[PDB]
Structure formats: C-alpha cells, structure tokens
DNA sequence: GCGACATAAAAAC
DNA sequence: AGTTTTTATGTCGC
C-alpha cells in the first residue's frame, strides 16, 4: 500500500496510490522525491572573457512533491501541487571567483548579463508545450501566475529535508535561518572588491536567488490527460538554464528585460523528466469512489 | 469535465 | 495550549 525509498539525506519518499489510500493534505507523506532528470542537450558555449576558459555547466534539479512512483510509472494529480527545485553548478569555477569575472557566449561574443532558469511542461510524445500555473499559499484567495524566469548564481541543491522545512515559513527568526541557503544579497558585499563589468553587478536585482524554487505548481486546468484512444498522455517537466543577454541562429526565448527593453534568454543546457502520467478529476482517481 | 466554494486534517506558530 | 495556515479533496452547478 505504501512503498518506501530512502532519499539521499536519510528522509523517506513514501509512494502511494491516491486511488487506494487517502492521506491528509499536510502529512509529511505528501513530500517525496519525484522522477530523476536526464540531459536533453547542451546549447551555447560560455567562455570567461580574458582567459577564454570554457565554463562547465550542470543543472541540478529535483522534484520534492506531487509525483509517485507507481508500478514503474511516475504519476501526478491534475488537482494537486508539485514542487520543482533547481540550482546549477560550474565545476571549474568557485562562486567567489565566478561573481568577479565576466563571461561571453561563443556563438562572435555576446556578453552574459546573468544566468537564469526557467521551467516548462511538454507533451513528451509530440513536444507540444503545456501551460503551468502557480498559486500562492492562499490559493484561490490569492493570485494565479505562470512560472517565471529565475536569475540564479551557482549553488549546491538543498537536501529534500531542507526544501520541506522551508516550504511554509513566515516566522522571521526561522526565515533568517534559511536566508543564506536561498539568497545572495548583493547589497551586503564589499563593492570595492568588484569591477564595474563583474557578473555580480549585471544581475537585475540586489536579492539574487541561489535556488530556483517552484512550489504550488500545477498543470493548467485545461489539460487533457488522456489521448482519444483512452491511453494516458505522457508529459515531461523541463528545466532550462540560460544566459540573459542584450539583443542589440541559436535557441533562445525573448524576455522582459530590466531596463524595459527586450532581452534574450539564450539556452545553455536543458534537462527533462521521463514520461509522466497525470490523473484527472474523475471520481475513479480517488479512494473516495471505492 | 471544469470554475467555484466547502470541508477537513496536520503543520506552523 | 489554543488559533491560524495550508492544501488534498468533496461537492455543486452548468
């Protein structure tokens, strides 16, 4: 009925089928590690502007809520939240050095303003994009929004337990405890240590995330979860690492820039999950029907 | 099948 | 120790 796997940090993931077992909304059993991500591809190379050294990049993503491993399928529920977190790392550059340096895209060199992550959902069989929506903790009593592009600096990915613990913090003392895990406050560095052209100082805001945390995420309410044949559709969640550049023949998305103009989010690397099944609102997807 | 509102149970404080 | 918050899901109306 409940199948248990030990996570990397010694917490457990407890996989259960909501058709058969109903668990309380805030039970820790609702937190669990989802499917592992795989490389789709690498895109534009990035080099350090004097040394010419290629920057090694790696996305480090994880799902922490919303998906169960049931009979060799990964299963989510249309009505319920998932959590997708990600960092990236630069194997050949320590953070402190990285932030003082400057980097170009090797297309012929566009200057990188900052690095950022976005997420997408797709139909895994035909590559059609599927809309994602997020809520605040207030859900229907607050606004709905689409996942945003998240500027980030390189960081290790927090353990599953840390993401759990930080999911619904309001208390100022507890917020302070987690601040250094999730944020870099540029306004607190010694500005004299940095050149005008340094990467740190081309990030758009002073508060810079170390971790992209997409919580309270759902597939859009309009998604059809079954094919006409009544077979389940297969979905996939994608994480894309990009370099944001000034636009003034490679994969990119347009982005609302900080100075008002049209920025370009140039793709660097993309990872995706294996195929995902999503259970819809049918009564037969719930233990209450039995 | 979906937008909307109701219930309810453990976390958070 | 009690109150408020958060989120899975139950249900109503079209």
UniProtKB/Swiss-Prot annotation:
Tell me the superkingdom of the source. Eukaryota
Q: What are the TM regions of this chain, as residue ranges?
A: none
Inducers of expression: Induced during prophase I of meiosis. Requires protein kinase IME2 for initial expression and continued transcription during meiotic divisions. Can autoactivate its own synthesis.
Could you say which residues are annotated as the site Interaction with DNA?
A: 26, 79, 139, 170, 216, 281
**Outcome of mutating residue 26 to A, per the record?**
Reduces DNA-binding by 65%
Q: What is the effect of changing residue 81 to A?
A: Reduces DNA-binding by 80% and abolishes sporulation
- Where DNA binds (residue ranges)? 1-290
What result follows from mutating residue 281 to A?
Reduces DNA-binding by 50% and abolishes sporulation
Q: How is it modified after translation?
A: Phosphorylated by pachytene checkpoint kinase IME2, but also phosphorylated in an IME2-independent manner. Phosphorylation probably eliminates SUM1-mediated repression and is also required for full transcriptional activation activity. Phosphorylation of the DNA-binding domain by IME2 does not alter DNA binding affinity.
Where is it localised?
Nucleus
Provide the effect of residue 79 to A.
Reduces DNA-binding by 95% and abolishes sporulation
Upon changing residue 78 to A, the result is: No effect on DNA-binding but strongly reduces progress through meiosis and sporulation
Q: According to its UniProt entry, what is the function of this protein?
A: Transcription factor required for successful completion of meiosis and spore formation. Gets activated after completion of meiotic recombination at the end of prophase I. Recognizes and binds to the middle sporulation element (MSE) 5'-C[AG]CAAA[AT]-3' in the promoter region of stage-specific genes that are required for progression through meiosis and sporulation. Competes for binding to MSE with the transcriptional repressor SUM1, which represses middle sporulation-specific genes during mitosis and early sporulation.
Subunit arrangement?
Answer: Binds to DNA as a monomer.
Q: What is this protein called?
A: Meiosis-specific transcription factor NDT80
Organism of derivation: Saccharomyces cerevisiae (strain ATCC 204508 / S288c)
* High-level lineage: Eukaryota, Fungi, Dikarya, Ascomycota, Saccharomycotina
Q: Which gene holds the coding sequence for this protein? A: NDT80
Portion held of the full protein: 33 to 335 of 627
């Amino acid at each position: 009925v409940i199948l248990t796997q030990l996570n990397e940090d010694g917490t457990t993931s407890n996989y259960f089928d909501k058709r058969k077992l109903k668990i309380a909304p805030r039970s820790t059993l609702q937190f669990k590690v989802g499917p592992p991500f795989e490389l789709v591809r690498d895109y534009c190379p990035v080099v350090e502007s004097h040394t010419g050294r290629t920057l090694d990049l790696r996305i480090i993503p994880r799902i922490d809520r919303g998906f169960d491993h049931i009979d060799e399928e990964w299963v989510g529920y249309k009505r319920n939240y998932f959590t997708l977190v990600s960092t990236f790392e630069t194997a050949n550059c320590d953070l402190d050095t990285f932030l003082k340096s400057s980097f170009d895209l090797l297309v012929g060199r566009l200057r990188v303003q900052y690095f950022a992550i976005k997420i997408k959902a797709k139909n895994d069989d035909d590559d059609t994009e599927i809309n994602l929506v997020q809520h605040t903790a207030k859900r229907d009593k607050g606004p709905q929004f689409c996942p945003s592009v998240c500027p980030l600096v390189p960081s290790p990915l927090p353990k599953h337990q840390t993401i759990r613990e930080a999911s619904n913090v309001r208390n100022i003392t507890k917020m302070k405890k987690y601040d250094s895990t999730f944020y870099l406050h540029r306004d607190h560095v010694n500005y004299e240590e940095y050149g005008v052209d340094s990467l740190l100082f081309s990030y758009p805001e002073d508060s810079i995330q170390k971790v992209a945390r997409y919580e309270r995420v759902q597939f859009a309410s309009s998604i059809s979860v079954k094919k006409p044949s009544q077979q389940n559709k297969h979905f996939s969640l994608h994480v894309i690492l990009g370099a944001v550049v000034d636009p003034d023949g490679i994969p990119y998305d347009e982005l609302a820039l900080k100075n008002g103009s049209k920025g370009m989010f140039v793709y660097l690397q993309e990872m995706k999950t294996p195929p995902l099944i999503i259970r819809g609102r049918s009564p037969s997807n719930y233990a209450s029907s039995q």
